Design a protein around this motif. Structure first.
Motif, short mmCIF file in Angstrom:
data_model
loop_
_atom_site.label_atom_id
_atom_site.label_comp_id
_atom_site.label_asym_id
_atom_site.label_seq_id
_atom_site.Cartn_x
_atom_site.Cartn_y
_atom_site.Cartn_z
N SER A 298 45.99 -17.39 18.98
CA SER A 298 45.58 -18.27 18.18
C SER A 298 45.42 -18.03 16.64
CB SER A 298 44.12 -18.61 18.80
OG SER A 298 43.87 -18.02 19.51
N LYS A 299 46.60 -19.48 16.40
CA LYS A 299 46.73 -19.61 14.66
C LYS A 299 44.92 -19.11 13.75
CE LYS A 299 49.64 -21.82 12.38
NZ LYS A 299 50.01 -21.26 11.22
N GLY A 300 45.41 -18.59 12.98
CA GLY A 300 43.86 -18.10 12.30
C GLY A 300 43.34 -17.27 13.18
N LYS A 301 43.30 -16.70 14.18
CA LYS A 301 42.35 -15.36 14.89
C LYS A 301 42.22 -14.77 14.16
CE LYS A 301 41.31 -13.26 19.24
NZ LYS A 301 40.25 -12.66 18.66
N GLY B 283 40.24 -16.16 11.28
CA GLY B 283 38.76 -14.98 12.86
C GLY B 283 37.81 -13.65 11.70
N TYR C 217 44.07 1.83 16.23
CA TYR C 217 43.23 1.74 17.57
C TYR C 217 45.11 1.44 18.78
CZ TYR C 217 39.14 0.61 14.60
OH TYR C 217 38.54 0.29 13.32
N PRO D 89 42.98 -5.05 21.73
CA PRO D 89 42.38 -5.64 20.11
C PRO D 89 41.63 -6.03 19.13
CG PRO D 89 40.76 -6.53 22.10
CD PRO D 89 41.95 -4.83 21.77
N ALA D 90 41.79 -4.83 18.92
CA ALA D 90 40.98 -3.68 17.86
C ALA D 90 41.84 -3.27 16.62
CB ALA D 90 39.96 -2.25 17.87
N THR E 113 42.39 -4.69 12.85
CA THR E 113 41.61 -4.22 12.28
C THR E 113 42.11 -2.81 11.74
OG1 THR E 113 39.78 -3.23 13.68
CG2 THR E 113 39.49 -5.50 13.72
N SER F 228 28.60 -2.84 18.32
CA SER F 228 28.27 -2.65 16.65
C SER F 228 27.23 -3.17 16.09
CB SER F 228 29.19 -2.23 15.91
OG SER F 228 29.07 -3.63 15.45
N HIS G 255 29.54 -2.33 3.85
CA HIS G 255 31.09 -1.58 4.23
C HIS G 255 31.90 -2.99 5.72
CE1 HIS G 255 32.68 0.77 8.19
NE2 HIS G 255 31.69 0.48 9.06
N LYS H 286 34.97 -10.63 8.68
CA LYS H 286 34.00 -11.69 9.08
C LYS H 286 33.00 -10.91 9.37
CE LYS H 286 34.93 -15.34 10.41
NZ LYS H 286 35.06 -14.92 11.77
N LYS I 44 28.80 -12.48 7.84
CA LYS I 44 27.56 -12.35 8.34
C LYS I 44 26.23 -11.22 8.58
CE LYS I 44 30.13 -13.09 12.99
NZ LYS I 44 30.21 -13.17 14.80
N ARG J 68 24.10 -16.19 19.12
CA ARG J 68 25.38 -16.40 18.67
C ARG J 68 25.26 -18.00 17.64
NH1 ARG J 68 30.44 -17.33 21.31
NH2 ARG J 68 32.04 -17.18 19.80
C1 LIG Z 1 32.98 0.29 14.09
C2 LIG Z 1 32.18 0.63 12.89
O1 LIG Z 1 31.48 1.02 12.53
S1 LIG Z 1 30.99 -1.46 12.92
C3 LIG Z 1 32.32 -2.43 13.69
C4 LIG Z 1 33.50 -2.89 13.55
N1 LIG Z 1 34.34 -2.93 14.80
C5 LIG Z 1 35.66 -2.24 15.47
O2 LIG Z 1 36.22 -1.85 14.31
C6 LIG Z 1 36.63 -1.63 16.54
C7 LIG Z 1 36.47 -2.88 16.86
N2 LIG Z 1 37.26 -3.77 16.64
C8 LIG Z 1 37.32 -5.90 17.30
O3 LIG Z 1 38.87 -5.78 16.60
C9 LIG Z 1 36.63 -6.12 17.84
O4 LIG Z 1 36.95 -5.34 18.90
C10 LIG Z 1 36.88 -7.63 17.36
C11 LIG Z 1 35.74 -8.27 17.87
C12 LIG Z 1 36.74 -8.36 15.99
C13 LIG Z 1 37.98 -7.73 18.33
O5 LIG Z 1 38.04 -8.82 19.85
P1 LIG Z 1 37.97 -10.06 19.98
O6 LIG Z 1 37.84 -10.90 21.53
O7 LIG Z 1 39.55 -10.37 19.49
O8 LIG Z 1 36.75 -11.10 18.96
P2 LIG Z 1 36.32 -12.54 19.12
O9 LIG Z 1 37.15 -12.82 20.60
O10 LIG Z 1 35.01 -12.22 19.40
O11 LIG Z 1 36.59 -13.73 17.86
C14 LIG Z 1 36.06 -13.23 16.61
C15 LIG Z 1 36.34 -14.04 15.55
O12 LIG Z 1 37.48 -15.00 15.48
C16 LIG Z 1 36.95 -16.45 15.73
N3 LIG Z 1 38.25 -16.58 16.26
C17 LIG Z 1 38.95 -16.82 17.54
N4 LIG Z 1 39.84 -17.58 17.35
C18 LIG Z 1 39.67 -18.19 16.52
C19 LIG Z 1 41.29 -18.72 16.13
N5 LIG Z 1 42.01 -19.24 15.95
N6 LIG Z 1 40.30 -18.78 14.94
C20 LIG Z 1 40.37 -19.17 13.75
N7 LIG Z 1 38.90 -18.17 14.00
C21 LIG Z 1 38.92 -17.50 15.40
C22 LIG Z 1 36.29 -16.38 17.17
O13 LIG Z 1 35.16 -17.55 16.85
C23 LIG Z 1 34.83 -15.11 16.25
O14 LIG Z 1 34.37 -15.49 15.41
P3 LIG Z 1 32.73 -15.38 15.35
O15 LIG Z 1 32.45 -14.05 15.81
O16 LIG Z 1 32.18 -15.50 14.08
O17 LIG Z 1 31.86 -16.20 16.19
#
Ligand SMILES: CC(=O)SCCNC(=O)CCNC(=O)[C@H](O)C(C)(C)COP(=O)(O)OP(=O)(O)OC[C@H]1O[C@@H](n2cnc3c(N)ncnc32)[C@H](O)[C@@H]1OP(=O)(O)O
Ligand SMILES: CC(=O)SCCNC(=O)CCNC(=O)[C@H](O)C(C)(C)COP(=O)(O)OP(=O)(O)OC[C@H]1O[C@@H](n2cnc3c(N)ncnc32)[C@H](O)[C@@H]1OP(=O)(O)O
Lengths: 449, 450
Positions: free
Chosen positions: B30-33, B37, B150, B154-155, B158, B208, B246, B251, B255, B295
């Motif tokens: 998605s755009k912006g994710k 995101g 990774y 989906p990671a 990051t 986490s 950290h 995002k 939080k 949430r």
């Molecule tokens: C490891 C540590 O020490 S601390 C924890 C950090 N974690 C890591 O480093 C490893 C994990 N890596 C990752 O990428 C994580 O699994 C995630 C959650 C960030 C990615 O998984 P995803 O399924 O893509 O995340 P998710 O579906 O929940 O969407 C992420 C955010 O973007 C938002 N979003 C989704 N699509 C869009 C979009 N087009 N535009 C804007 N925002 C969007 C979501 O609403 C969500 O926002 P929110 O958390 O404020 O509610």
């Protein structure tokens, strides 16, 4: 914030062991090549039920129990090890389930790592914490846990396994002479674990000793130069009552101390008796050539043997009967010194040498004080009960020991299994932690008792 | 030893990067994710020539030269990292080849390790050394180096890579408020590297947050409880000028701070006005277990924290939003962003720091910034770091070359006996950088320099 140091110790090692004459016979070694060649008598090793987490539990709890210690006046817990269970989640976190039902979560510390030196590095980090502005009046706790295992090469007899816990706090029977120490570290490839799947390291046997010696020299020299600027005198082997070394095997500790006597000759210290011209054929050598001359080793051993029997031999019991304990070896050797000389050690000075391949090394000084129970040299030797634990082992026959070590290869970094309690859970002591299972997600679950 | 803290910093990250907008399109997102995101703008990553040893060399040397500090006034060197190159020989020993042409081998320190916390643990170990009886008047030096990588999931967005060096010594522009801190540590399986062959970690869904929250709660709570016994008053969002976290992704930083404002609501702090006490109170019927999962309480917390966020953390976001997740170095690239964006301001302020590593390990501690005399001053550090010029000196990859590189790194991870392809890539490295040439038949590693 005064005279902080070791307040308590306890030691755990697996009761499963093989004896070295029995293992000389099993493999193809001349008689004496392990008992006299390496100076080893018995080899302890982890079965499928024990690991560095397990051994950590046994050492931690037993120190808190027998010394009647509140888990909540632990302000810092640090672990020194080189056994990699997980590459991101440390042993320290695993240990935190001993403090879960205690509510204590405000504890500092993590893993320190570099071959057999991490345990000493953790000890040093911990003392500097008690003397820190960040201190909070609580005890430090240091863990040294390792399982030393090699391939079926010539290094397998030099294996071992053990865990040691040490309670760090002020007004200790074992005080640190903070400024009398010397460190030496370089980038060398004498021994390291570059194969991430294997629990076995590559060892460059020749260079292990050569590197160990260069460090032991430089550490002794730096220590002597700080003794010189503090108390005006030159330091010598006679300015210390006991010397305890990293003990990968006995013959290396023999040479290491004899090498300290050689270093006294090149500076003509008060420790070199006049009958001791026996050295003089070797004063035309540079220090690069000194390391390799197999007679200078063999000559230094001759006049240091009487000194060795007085200042090193009591430090040999557990390393000679457990094996190489890596980060914990130096502190099992010190534990041997406490067990066999607790009644005498008040007032004495004990110099300690720690080595890890890579390399990292530090020689530091302890002066022992008599203190009051439970934190007293006499009570530590009682609680460690080294005599009864050695007395409580089970030997494996040399062929079943090899079968255990082949089972451990497949369980290293392994997924999804339950450990086989057949008959073995019987031989560990009542109350010991042990590995029960690791699930499909590598998570590990331990039981007790 | 007095007013001990950070005297100097320098930071290195690879010049090869991807932009997350370009990678949203490529990964079919998605755009912006990724930009909104996850809040990330550009993802730095190591090529076949760079690694944590390489990056460590760049950060160490660049700190000693640009600050003109003698390698023989280093008394302790510690490395915080979670990238395992070797399981026994530490990164610290590798760094000792910078000190052989100096004869300085009397350095203490080894590697400290636990997820993204080892760098903080080293920094704290190093502070306690300068204040120790064992001190010898020489500088401590702390390194945080990591490559966050990774599998393609989906990671992967990051990811990141960087190394940071910090000089520890007395009478610093960045002094440690030694007793004003709080730690939390537990045994959790939220993120860990259990497969020794792969450099990729296991992640257990959103654990986490459940853990990060419990730690950020407990750490903040313990720090507040120490503020009352030090200075009589309660602690609040307003008793510090800047909050640094950290930063695995942006995002979570939003939080994390928004979550700190919720913890102030539950303690009736001077920071909560009636517009906020209103908006929060529909939510004080929650248990603290449920708070972790709400949430809705999150997004409400982010709304009432937005102006505070814009003033006390948004400057701490520059480097992490343009480099990615740097693990042990994450917190300190964020702090480096704060020095770069407000060096003219930072005299007299209090800056609170939060560090987390999965496993888990956590500590929130406070720093006070002093304006002091150059070269150890906030204005000269921002000059020497020159983060602005480092960012302008990047070279952008197209999203499929970034993916082609990252499966090449899988083939070099834990691999022996190969030579790296410098053609075209070494073009992109700045003049001076260290890089890996080959790994021989015995896994030994050899590095070069421009
Ligand atoms: C490891 C540590 O020490 S601390 C924890 C950090 N974690 C890591 O480093 C490893 C994990 N890596 C990752 O990428 C994580 O699994 C995630 C959650 C960030 C990615 O998984 P995803 O399924 O893509 O995340 P998710 O579906 O929940 O969407 C992420 C955010 O973007 C938002 N979003 C989704 N699509 C869009 C979009 N087009 N535009 C804007 N925002 C969007 C979501 O609403 C969500 O926002 P929110 O958390 O404020 O509610
Ligand atoms: C931090 C650290 O240093 S610990 C981790 C690094 N070190 C290690 O891992 C240990 C490495 N593993 C090893 O096995 C050791 O390198 C070695 C030296 C025992 C290699 O095994 P080997 O091939 O048997 O070496 P080697 O032939 O030299 O035998 C060693 C000793 O036994 C002696 N010896 C050999 N056979 C016999 C025998 N039948 N009877 C008595 N002594 C014997 C040798 O004289 C030699 O002793 P010396 O040094 O006083 O001359």
């Amino acid at each position: 914030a005064k005279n902080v140091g070791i307040l308590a110790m306890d030691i755990y090692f697996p009761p499963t062991c093989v004896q070295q004459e029995a293992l000389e016979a099993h493999d193809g070694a001349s008689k004496g090549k392990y008992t006299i060649g390496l100076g080893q008598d018995c080899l302890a090793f982890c079965t499928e039920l024990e690991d560095v987490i397990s051994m950590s539990f046994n050492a931690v709890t037993s120190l808190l129990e027998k010394y009647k210690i509140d888990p909540k006046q632990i302000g810092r817990l640090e672990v020194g090890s080189e056994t990699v269970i997980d590459k991101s989640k440390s042993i320290k976190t695993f240990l935190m389930q001993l403090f879960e039902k205690c509510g204590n979560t405000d504890v500092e510390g993590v893993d320190s790592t570099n071959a057999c030196y991490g345990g000493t590095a953790a000890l040093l980090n911990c003392v500097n914490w008690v003397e820190s502005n960040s201190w909070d009046g609580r005890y430090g706790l240091v863990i040294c846990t390792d399982s030393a295992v090699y391939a079926e090469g010539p290094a397998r007899p030099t294996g071992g396994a053990a865990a040691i816990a040490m309670l760090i706090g002020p007004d200790a029977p074992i005080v640190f002479e903070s400024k009398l120490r010397g460190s030496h570290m370089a980038h060398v490839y004498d021994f390291y674990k570059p194969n991430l799947a294997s629990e076995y390291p590559v060892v460059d046997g020749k260079l292990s000793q050569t590197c160990y010696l260069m460090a032991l020299d430089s550490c002794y020299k730096h220590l002597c130069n700080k003794f010189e600027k503090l108390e005006g005198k030159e330091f010598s082997i006679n300015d210390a009552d006991y010397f305890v070394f990293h003990s990968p095997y006995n013959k290396l500790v023999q040479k290491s101390f004899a090498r300290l006597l050689y270093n006294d000759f090149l500076r003509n210290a008060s420790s070199i008796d006049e009958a001791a011209e026996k050295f003089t054929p070797y004063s035309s050598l540079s220090l690069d050539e000194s390391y390799q001359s197999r007679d200078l080793e063999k000559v230094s051993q001759q006049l240091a043997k009487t000194y060795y029997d007085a200042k090193v031999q009591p430090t040999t019991l557990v390393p000679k009967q457990v094996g190489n304990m890596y980060t914990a070896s130096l502190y099992a050797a010190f534990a041997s010194l406490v067990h066999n000389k607790h009644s005498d050690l008040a007032g004495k000075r004990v110099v300690m040498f720690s080595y890890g391949a890579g390399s990292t090394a530090t020689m530091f000084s302890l002066r022992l004080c008599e203190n009051q129970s439970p934190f007293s040299l006499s009570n530590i030797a009682s609680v460690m009960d080294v005599g009864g634990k050695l007395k409580a082992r089970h030997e494996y026959a040399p062929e079943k020991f090899v079968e255990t070590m082949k089972l451990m290869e497949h369980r290293y970094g392994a997924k999804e299994f339950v450990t086989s309690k057949e008959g073995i859970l019987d031989l560990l002591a009542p109350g010991t932690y042990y590995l029960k299972e690791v699930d499909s997600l590598y998570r590990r679950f331990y039981g007790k008792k």
